[PDB]
Every structure is written in structure tokens, then in C-alpha cells.
């Protein structure tokens, strides 16, 4: 079961080599920091797909060990909220890494939307930072200053396009259901 | 039993592939977000049926680790409520993902209905976000802003009428009762 | 035993199919929401019987993880009470789902009866929300607003009539007691 | 031992079919609601006997998870008390149901008798609500507004006469003592 | 050991049949109640002997889950005390029932004797309510109004004369000591 | 070990028979309650020897689940103390009974001796009440008012005379010391 | 090991017989109660030696479940202190008895020596009360009013004389050191 | 290992006999106490060595269940401190005894050194009282007034000269190092 | 599973040799300390990659034992925040080291990013210090002042230029997916 | 493993005999008590080496069950600090001893260095006090006044000159590496 | 795994003998205390390398049981901070030692940098003091005064030159990867 599943030699060796790879510019987003340098980052859903592909859908796991609301301050009808979350990522063999993420919302008049923004971003932030610890392929490169301006010296690539033809159109999945019947 | 059954290679392979698939326009709704443009999301019952079909009715599970009422504010005879929930989804082999969901009710005059909406929406929101982490087919595609733009480039779908003919007639389920009898 | 009984393939598949089924109008009720539209729902006693038929009387279970009284307000000789309950449903193999339910009492002069209503409604509501996570047949179809529009397609049903001719009238259940019976016949 | 004892096919089958039965008018009582309609209910001692015959004296069990006094209010020389109880019923195979019951005492001048009445009524009420989850025969039919209509269409009959000719008059139970001796 | 001693069929069937029996008038006591008819009840020492003969001295057990003094009120030099107790009864196979009992002392001037009376009555009251869940012979018949009516029609009998001829007079138990010795 | 044994049929049967016996007047003492008639009781040291002879010195056990001082009141230089104890008796096979005992000291001027008397009597009182749940021979007969009236029809014999001839006079126990050596 | 050592038939039977013995006047001491008559008691060091000879130095054990200082009162430069202790005695097979002891110091001018005396006496007192539940030989006889009457009718005899010729004078115990070496 | 190692028949009977011995005057010290009494005691280091020779360096153990500072009082630049300790002694077979010890410092002007003396005396005192329960040779004779009377009727002896010729002068220990190597 | 796999003979030997190696100048950065000379440190992402390469992506793990915010101080519109974190690193055989890290924000005008900065740096700061404990190659050399001297005596090396040709381009990992497939 | 490793017959005999040894003057130090006599003691490092040689570096262990700061008093610009520590020492077989140590700093003007001194010396003091319970050789002789008399009659020996020729000069220890590599 | 691996005879004997060694002056630093003696110590990183080499990178482990900030004092724009930490060191066989360390910062004007310094010093301080318990080779001789002044009698060496040629320059580690691949 999960946490007691020891890696085979072949699967171990493949995953080790795979994690060294750095991410191409298709993976990286940007936004200029307020008053300062354009911070590069990876979007949450890309990290999840990376992990799901790196380890398998049943190969990694994550939980929220703790989340905490540091402050909600009201100044002239506007809200300022910071939230941290502690996120622990685990693999099928028991391996694990845990890190902190943070979340911010300032200036909205809805207290709710402030807290919703902060509480949510704190978690994925923690999830991304936790996953980085497994190697380059899950975001560990994003902070290598040498790697970064290498990306800036690459031609600005126009976004991809997804082909929604063979997209999932019904709930039913006969291929899995067949395989699952052979499980019980 | 649950938390123990290892995936077979057969079932693992099928589910691994199945989860990569993106979701068609059948699955996406749109509201009008606070202060911003059209926001896409998936309604809860679709996530449920996706999961139930992806993993089996007994193949996945979820619990509420915690739910906190952030505030109940009375301003202009209307109640403003924010609620978070932490929802952990687990599969039959012990693999798991947990995330936060949030629930908001602003402007209703019923304190009761405000608390009810926020508490109930916090839970569903957390269940969806937790399920996302398993892959595209359970909602991870919804945030790929490239997927969303390609989604608008398809003809508008019309409400598919559901054929209620073979609807469940009696409580009784004879095939189940036969199978359940011989399981003893 | 319960929590450790794994489903046979012959049983797993039947339930998997059966849970996909949508519910006919025999299962659906409606009432006037406060200030708004017709809201459809399934009554608690039907969800219970659905679960009993889907899983067996000993195939599913539920517990109250927590109940909290959000407020008891007194306004003009009337009480306002809101209560949540966290209800966790489990099947005999350990799979489980948990959700929140809510309960409301507005306008009563009895605080006691206000709390009684809210606390109980919260639990039954939470039980239903947890069971429906298992599929359409336990109530997950009720929210598909294509399903609801299709429901308004069938002519409104006549209420079913209960035939009490074979109603249970004594505690004894010979058929049940017989299944337990052991002859105890010895060798001599 | 209790909680670890699987149902045989024969016992499972008989109980599953038996629990579907609706209850005859012998089981049903009625009471004046304050300001409102006749309320039908089943008396506790009748549910206990139903459970003992359905499951065996050692086939079911119940405990009080928690009881809380919601309030003790004194208004115009009378006490007003509400009490909730959380009652969990379990069968010998480990299956279980838990529900809340409520106990009310309005108008008595003794705080003692008010609390006694509400505390005990809460437990019994919770026990009844928990057992009803197993099926019609244990009380799930009482809320079925169609069931209640057919009950009204039956001739209102006599009360039963109990024949105390075979009533227990002595503590000793030779059949039990024989069976228990032969078991060590 | 206790809690792990599954019942044999021969003892189960004997006890299940035996618990159905109603109790004769030898078991029932009466007091006139305020605002109602005579109230019937069974004295504690009779329930204990019923339980001992039904299950064996080592076949049933009880503990006090909790006892709570609801209040000690001093009014007019007199004490009003209400106490509840939660009592859990278990059989040797692990079967169990738990209930609340209540204890009342109103009008006494000694706080000590008020608390003593209410605390003890609460435990015994709770034990009686728990044991009657096992069936009619342990007191569940006492609440059946039809049984009660039939009891009233029964000839009233003068108390039993107790024959102290072979009352225990010395501590030693030779048959017990012999049996205990053999077993080591 | 203790709690994990199991009675042989022989010991079970002898003890079940012996516990039914009622107690002769040798065991019964009496005191006039404050303001009321005579109360009959069994002295603690008698209950202890009954239990030791009934069950063996290593066959029964007791612990104090809890002791609570209800109040220490000083009124006109006199102390009023009420104390309860919860006492659980267990037999070697794990069966158990728990009850409450109460201890009272009213009117003394020494606070030390008030607490001492109440605390100790509460424990002995609870032990007596717990052991009597095992049957008549351990005190359950004391509540049989018919048993009591039958006792009054017996002229009270003179206090027994104790023959201190074969009294233990040195610590050493040769019979015990011989057996203990062989058992290693 | 301790708590797991079932008694052999021989050791059980010797001890059962030995514990019935009443104690000679060599064991019994006396004091005067405050304002009243003679009170007999057994000194701690004699109860310890009784237990060691009855059960073996490794056959019984005791622990302090709890000690509470009920009060430290200062009256005209004199301290009044009451302390209770809960003491649990266990035999090598797991059987056990627990009781409360009380310790009193009145009138000393040192608060320290008041607490020391009270704390230590409560523990010894609790040990005495717990051990006496095992039978007459460990002190249960002292409360028998008939035993005390017979005891006061025996000759009051001379203080014993201790022969210190065979007293231990060096730490080493060659007989013990021999046996212990032949055991590893 | 410790707590698990049962006693052999030989080691048991060696220690049982040996523990009966009363101590010679080499072990006994005396201080003067308030009110003129001569108080006899055994010094800590002698009790430790007695225990080490009776049980082996690895045959007994002790822990501090709790230590509490009852009070630190300042009167006229001098401190009054009382400290208790609960000390539990265990033998290698699991048998155990626990007792309270008390530590006192009165009259010192250094608060620090008062607390040091008190905390340290409580622990050693508690160890002495705990070891005492195993028998005379570990101090139970100290409280016997007959033993004490007999000690005075003995001629006094010069303090024994200790011969440091064979005293350890280097850390290294060849005999053990040889034996320890042969074990791994 | 993780924490349960004991190192092979030569895996140990290779890692034991490898960890002694000192780090080259490619790894070291420097920030001008406030008011003082150069302080050298190693950036988080390189330590992570060092650890991943030293032990394998699944060979080491880390968790945040605790994090605390020592202070958030507001002085003239500037925020001062200190945060500590305790980080525990574990190897696949259970070996572990734990240490503290610290995080600081001085001078920012935003409360949120101040807390964000401090909490996040404390964690990674805490991660490095713990990993350093495994040997020179994981950061233990940075504190050797001779090692730092020899570093300045080295040619001032230009930054790396990472070759983004073989950068990871798509989520899917066929070699891993193949190896993962054949492990079920 | 540690805590579970029984002593061999030969090693037990060696350590038992070895521990009797009294310590030569090489181990003993002295000091002035404030206004007090000559206090003899053993320095911390000497006990550490004594234990390491007596039991093996892996034969004994210790932990701080608790440390508590009794007071930090500021008197005349000087700090007075008292700190206790509870220290538990364990041998590889599960044997253990726990004792209290105290640490004192009086007269320093730095609060920080005061607490440091007290906290540190309490631990060493407690470790010494716990170790000495194993026998004379580990420090139990220091309290024997007769032992201390012989120390005076022995020539005041000089502080030994230590030969630093064979001092360890490099981290590497090749001889150990052979034996450990041989083990995996 | 770690904590469960017993030392081999060969490895024990190597480590025992090796730990005896005293450390050369290459290991020792010196800093003069304010107004008093020059105090010798060992730098943290040297102890780590000593420990890593003495026991192996996987042979020893350490954790922080607790860290406390005793006080944060601001006097005239300067911060005074004292911090203690309790650090527990364990070997692969379960052996352990724990000690307290302290961390000091006085006179800095930045609260953040003061607390950072103190928290980090206490851990390293505690780690060194715990390790010194394994023998002289890990720092136990540093306090031996004969050893200390003997250190000055040695030619004061200037720091040896570190050779950065063979420094680890890339992350990749081929030798370990070979052994790591075959370990599966």
C-alpha cells in the first residue's frame, strides 16, 4: 500500500535521471513584482501534472499539516490578510518533504474574498515549494539565477494550443472498468 | 480493505492514462466572478461521477479534516460569512491528497441560510480542489488558461436532455441482492 | 467484519452499475424555498431505504463526527436556530464519505422545540449529502439541472399507496430466528 | 466476539428481507403536538423488543457518545429544559448507525424532574432514531407520509390482552444454567 | 476472557427465549405518583438477581461512564440535588447497552445526605435502565401499559416469607474451595 | 494472568450456587439513621472476607476510579464533609462491577478527622456496593425487605468468641515458603 | 515476570489458608483517640514484613496512584495539615487492591515537618488499608470487634528482644551472589 | 532484559532469606531532632550499596515519578523550604515499590542552596523509603522499636578504616573489557 | 519502506567517501553583511540538488518540526520580523539530524511579504543547517575558516551557462512510465 | 539493541566486582562551601570516562527527563539563579537510575551567563548523582566519611602530565572503517 | 534500521579504543572571556566531522527536544538574549546522550539578529555537549585541566592549508549511483 511500496531498481533509476531535467519556457510564467523585479514562477496545475506524470497518480500524496491566519487588518474599509500553510508531500515508499507556503490579499472590501484568496494560495504555494525538494524537474530550477536569464535569452514563445477532439466526453471509462473487474 | 488494496498493473495503467484526458465543454459552467470576467468551474456532482467512474464507488473516499467559521458579520441587515474546509481525498491503496476549500455568503438576510451556504460550499470546494490533484480528468485541466481559450473556440453546446426511461423504479436491486447473498 | 470486508467482483460490479441509475419521480419531493423557486429533494426515509437496498442493512454505516449549534437567537418571542452536523458514511470495506448538513428553526416560541428541530435536521441533511457522494442512485442526480428539467417532463405522479395487509404485527421473526437456530443434536 | 462476528448468508438474508416490513398499528402511538397535528411515534420499549427479536439480545448494542444540556431556563415558576444525546447503535458484525435525540421538559416546577425527563427522553429518542436507519421494521416507516395515510385507513382496534399465566415468577433459569454449564 | 467469550448456540438460544418472558407480580412494586396512576417499578436488588441468574455472576458487568451533579440548591434551609449517571452494561461476549439514570434529593437539610442519596440512586437507576434493553425479563415489560393493566387484574399476594434455614453462616465455601484448587 | 483467566465449569458452578445464599444474622449489623428507623448493614471487614472466601485472595480485585470531595463546609466551628468514591471490582476472568460510595462527616471540630473519615468511608462504602452486584452472598440480600423481616423473627445471638490460640505469632509462613520455592 | 505469574495450586492453597489467620498480640499496637477510647493498629514495618513473608519479596508490589494535600492551615503559629494518598497493591499474578490512606499533622511549629509527617503517614496508611483487603493475616482482623475483645483478654506480654548477634554487618551476600551468577 | 527477567529458584530463596537480616550498627547513624529525641537513620550511600549487593548493579532501578516544591518561605533573611519526591524502585522481574520522601532546609540565607538541599534530600529520602519495603536488610528494621532498643545495648565500635591500597587509579578495566568483547 | 531500509555494504562506503569532499567555488555565493565583511553561504537549490544526488530523490526526507514567529514589530512604517523553524532531515535507514533556521525581514513596509520572507527563509535556512550535519559535502565546510581562505585564493570564475537544448519539454516520461508499469 | 541487550554471565560478574572499587585521589577534587567545610567531588569529565570504561561507550545512556528554573532574582545588580534538572541514566539492558541535579549562579552581573552556568551544571550534577547509584567506582564512595578519612591520609598527589604524542590528529579513523564495512 | 542495529564485535572494539584518544591542537580554538581566563572549545563543524568519521554519516543522529528563549531584554537600544536548547544524540544501536546548550547575544541593536544568534548557538552548543559524552575523542577531554595547560606546552601551530584541487565540483556522483542502483 502507499507508504510501504519500495521502488524497484528500474523505476528508481528512471525517476532519478528524470528529476535532473530543467523546465523549458513552456512551463514558466512571470509577473513584475510591485516596485521590483519580474518574479518567475510555475503555475500550480503544471506542477501537479509534472508530479502526476513523474510518480503516477497513486505515486505521490500531500496533506496540510497546518494552516494559520496571521492577520486580518481593516484600514479605511480595505482588508489586508496574510496566511501561511505547511504542506507535506509523500511518495509511495515513505519519502517525504515538507515546506511552507504563503498567501496574501490586500484592499478588497469583502473580508471573505480576502481570506479565500489568502487561504487558497498559501496551500498551492506550500505544495509547489514542497515538491521542489524532489529535484530540478519539479521546480527546483526556478530559483537558480544562472538558469533564469538563460530563459530570458530564449525567443519569446507564443502559447501552445490544446486539441479538444479526443477530449473526455462522458463520465464512463470502459477501459479502466474492465481492468478493475479483473482486480476483485 | 480500503487503504490497503494495491492497484494491479492492469487497473493502474488504465487509470494513469484516463486521468490525463482533458474535459469537454459538457463539464464547464460559468458565473460572474467578483470584480472580474467569466470564471469557469465544474459542478460538484460531475466531479463526484467522474471520481465514481474513474476509481469505482468504493475506490475513493473523502473526509473533512476541519471546518472553521472565519466570521459572521452583520452589516446593513445582511450577513457576511466566510468558511473554510480542509478536505482529504483518499484512494483504495492509501494514496491521498488534501486541499482547502472556501465558502462565502454575502448579502442574504438569513443568518441561518448564510451559514448553511458557506459551510456547504466550503466542503464541496475543498473536495473538488483535492480531487483536481489527481489529474486532468478530475478537474486539473480547468486552470490551464490555454485549455480555457481553446474551449471558447468550440460551438456552444445545447442542454443535453437526459432520458429518464430506465430510471430506478423500486428500492430493490435484484442483481445486487444475488451477488450480496453469494458473497457470504 | 465491518470495515474489513472486501467486495467480491460479483458484488462490486452490480453496485457500480446500480449506483449510476438516476432516480424516477417516485423518489423526488419539492417545497417552496424562502423567497424563491421550487427546490427538489429526497426525503430522509427514502435515502435510508436506498442505502439499505444498495448496500444491505449491514453494508453501510454512519456516525456524527461533530455537531455545532451556530446560534440561538431570540427576536420578538421567536427563536432563530442554526445547527451544522458532520456526518461520515462508511461502507463495509472501509471506503467512506463525509459532508456537512444544516438544520434551521425559525419562528417558534419554544427554544426546546427549535433546537430539537435544528439538531435533527442537521444530522439527516448531512447523512443525505454523504450518501449521494456514492452516486446518482443515492441522490447525486438531484443537482443535475438537466435531470430536473427532464423530471418536469413526466406527468405528475399519483402518490403511491401503502398496502398494510402484510404489516408486521408481532416482534417475533421466525424466519430470522430459524436462520440462527442450531439443532444442538449430540452424538451418543 | 461482539463486533467481530460476520453474518451468515442465511441470517443476512432473513434479516434483510425482514427489515423491509412496515409496522402494523399495534406499534404506533399518537400524541398531541403543541398547537398542531397528531404526531405518530413508536414507544421505546417496543423498539427495544423489535431490535432484540430482529438481531438477537446479543446482536445489537448501543452507547451514549455524548449528552449535552442545551439550557435550563426558569420562566414564571416553571422550568424549561432541552437536552440532546448522541446515540450510536452497533450490530455484532461492526456495522453501526449514530443519530441525535432530543429531550424536552416544559412547565414543571422541579428542576430535578425537568432534567431527569429531558435527559432520559433524549437517550431514548436518540436510540429510536439510530435503530430506524436499519430499515422499516425498526421505525423508518414512521416518517413516510404515505405509510401514515394507510394507517389512518385501518379500523382502530382494541388493545391486546397479556396472558400472564406463563410469566416469570422465580429468578432461576434451569435451561440457561444447563446451557451455560455445558459451555465451560 | 470477559468481552471475548462468544456465546455458544445452546446458551444464546436459551437466553434469547428466556429474556422474552414477562415478570410476574412477585417482581413488581408500586407507589402512587403525583398527577398519574400508581407507578410500577422493580427494585434494584431484584434486577441484580435477574441479571445474575440470566447471565451468570461472571456473565454481565457494569461501569459508570460518568456521573454529573446537575445542581445543589439551598432554599429555605433545605437542599435540592439532582444527579445523573451514565451506566454501561456489558455481557461476556462484548454486547453492551448504556443508559442514563437520575437521582434526586429535594427537601433535606443535610447537604451530605442529599448528595449521597442522589449520587447512589442515579447509579442504580442507570443500571436498571441499561439492563432492561436486553429484554422483558430484565425489566423492559414494565413500560408496556397492556402488561401493566393485566398485572392489575392479577390476584394481590401477601409478601413471601423468607426461609433463613440454610442462610450462609460461615465464610468458608468448601465446594468452591475444592473447585478452585483443582483448577490451578 | 489476572483478568485473562477463565473459570472452570467446576469453579463457576460452585460460585454461582454459593452466591445465591442469603446471609445469616451473624453478618448483619444495624444503626438508627438520623431521625429515622434502623438501617441494617454489613461491616466492611466482613465483606472483604466473604469476597476472599468466595473468590480466592487472588480471584477478585478492586481499584478506585475516582474520589471527589463534594464540599468541606465550616459552620459554627464544626465541619461538614461529603465525599464520594467510584470503586470498580474485577474478578480474575475480567468481569467487573463499579458503583459509587459515599462518606460523610458532620459536626466534628477537626477538619483533618472529618476528611479522613469521609474519604475512607466513601471507599469502603463503594467497595461494598460494587461487590454486592455479584449476588446475595456479597450483600445483595440486604435490600430484600422480606429478608430483613425474616431476620427480625430471630432472637439475636450473643457475639461470637474468637479463639486466639492458633493466632499467627511470627512473620514466617513455612507452608507458603515451601510451596513458593517449588514454583520457581 | 511480575504481573504475569499465575499461582501454582500449592502456593495458592498455602496462601489462602495462611491469610485466614488472625494476628497475635505481638502484631497489635494501640493509642488513644482524641476524646475517646483505645484504638488498635498495626505498625507499617510489621505490615511490610507480613507481606514479604506471605508473598515473597518479589510477590507483591505497590504504587502511589495519587497524593493530595487537602489543607495547610496556620493557627496561632501552629500548622494543621491533612494529606491523603491512594495506594495500589498488586500481587505477582496481577490481582490488586487500592485504598486511600490519610496523614495528619497538628500543632508543630515547622510547616516543613508538618508536611513531611502528613505526606509519609498518608502513604503508609494507604498501604496498610490496601494490604488488609487480602485477608486477616494482613490486617483485616483488626476491625473485628469480637477479635479485639478476645485480644484484650490475653496476657499483655513483655516487649520482644531482638538478638543482633546474627545481624548483617557487611554488604556482600555470598549465598545470593552465588545464586545470581548461576543464572545468566 | 530489565523488567522481564524472572528470578530463579535459587536466587529467589537466597534473597528472600538474606532480606530478613536486621542491620548491624555499622549501618546506623543518628542526628538530634527537635524536642530532644535521638533519630536513627541509614545514610544514602549505604542503602545504594546494600541494594547493589542484594540485587546486583543491574538487578534494581529507580525513577522519580514526581517532585514537588511545597513552599519557599522567607522569614528574617532565612529561607524555609519543604520538597517532596515520589520515588519508584523496580527490580529486574518487574516487582516494584514506590514511596514519598521529603527534604527540608530551614535557616539558610541562600535561597539557591536551600532549594538544592531540599530537592536532593527528598529524592534520596524517597529512595530509602521505597527500598525499605523489600525487607529488613534494606532498612525495614529501622522503625522496629525492639530492634532500636537492642542496638543501644551494644558496645559502640570504632569507624572502620577503609584500605585504599586496591583503589581504582585508572579508568581502564581489563577484566570487564575482556568479558564484554566476548559478548558481541 | 523509508526509514526501514538498511544500507548495503558498498552504498554506505561510497556515500561515506563522497560526503567528505569539500565544495568547489561554483556552489558558493556571498552577500555583504550589514556593517561587516563578506559572509559566505550556499543557496538552497544547490543544497537540495546536492542532497538529491548524494542520497537519491527518495533517499532523504525533511519535515518542519515547528515554526515560530519571534516578533512582528512596527516602527515608523517599517516591519521587523524574526522567525525560527526547526527542520528534521532523515535518511532511508532512519538516521536523522535536526536543527534550527532563522528568517528575517527588516525595513519592508508590507506586513505580509515580511512574514512571507521570514517564514520561508527560516525553513530553507533550517534545511541547510540540518543537512550540513551529514558531512562536508552538504555544507559543513562553509564554516571552516581555512577553507574560506583557500576559496578567495581561487580564480574568480564566471557564472555557468546552462544549455537549455535537452531541457525537459513535455510532462510525460516514457522511460519512467515503462519502468513504473513493470513494478506492479 | 540498546535497552534490550542482556548482560552475559561473565560481563555481569566483571562489572559487579569492578563497581565495588573505591576511587583513588586522582579522581577526587575539593572546594570551599560558602562558610562551609571542604566539599569533595568528582569532575564531570571523570565520571563520563568512568562510565564509558565501565560499561562501554554504547553500554550506558542518559537523558534529561526535565529541567526547571526555580528562580532568577536580581539582587544588588547581581543575579541569583537556581536550576534543577532531572537526569535518567540507562544501561544497555534496561537498568536505570534517575536523580536530581542542581545548578547555581550567584553574583554575576550578566543574566545570560548566570542561567547558562546554572542550566549546564544542573545537568552534569544530575548525571553524576544518577551514575553514582551503580556503585562505589562511579562516585558512590564520595559520601562515605570513612572513605574520605583515608583520602586525607594518602599523600596529596600531583596533577598528572598527559602525553599528547599519540593524540588524534585527523578526523579519519581507518581501523574502525574496516570493521564496519565488514558488517554490511 | 537506525536505532535497531547492534554493533559488531569488531566495530565495537574499534570505536571503544578510538574514543579514548585525546584530540590535538588542530581541533582546539580559544577565546578570552570578558575580564577572565582564556577558554578552549571545539568548533561545531569539527565535532560534526569527528562524529561523522567516528560513527559514520549514518551511525549517529541528533534531535532538538526543546529550545527556550529565557528572556529578551532591551537596555539602551541593545538587546540581551539567552537561549537554551536540549539536544539528544543517538547511535545506530539505540545508545543516546542528551544535554543542554546555551546561546548568548548581548549588545546588538537588531532584535532579529540577536535572537538568530542565540537560537543557533544553543543548538550547536547542546550538540557538542551531548557528543562529548561518548568519550575524549569527541570533546570530553576539553575540560580536563591537566590536558588543557599541557596544550600550551605544544608548538603553537598556524592553520594548515586546505587543498581545493580535488573539491567536489559537480552534483553528479557516479560511484554512489552504481552502488545505489544495485542496492534495489
UniProtKB/Swiss-Prot annotation, chains A, B, D, E, F, G, H, I, J, K:
The modification Phosphoserine is found at residue 175. Belongs to the RAD52 family. Residues 128-132 bind DNA. It is found in: Nucleus. It comes from Homo sapiens. Phosphorylated upon DNA damage by ABL1, and probably by ATM or ATR. This is DNA repair protein RAD52 homolog. The full-length protein forms heptameric rings. Interacts with ABL1. Interacts with RPA2; the interaction is direct and associates RAD52 with the RPA complex. Interacts with RAD51AP1. Disulfide bonds: none annotated. The modification Phosphotyrosine is found at residue 80. Signal peptide: none annotated. The chain holds residues 25 to 208 of 418 of the full protein. Changing residue 31 to A: Abolishes ssDNA-binding. It comes from the Eukaryota. Involved in double-stranded break repair. Plays a central role in genetic recombination and DNA repair by promoting the annealing of complementary single-stranded DNA and by stimulation of the RAD51 recombinase.
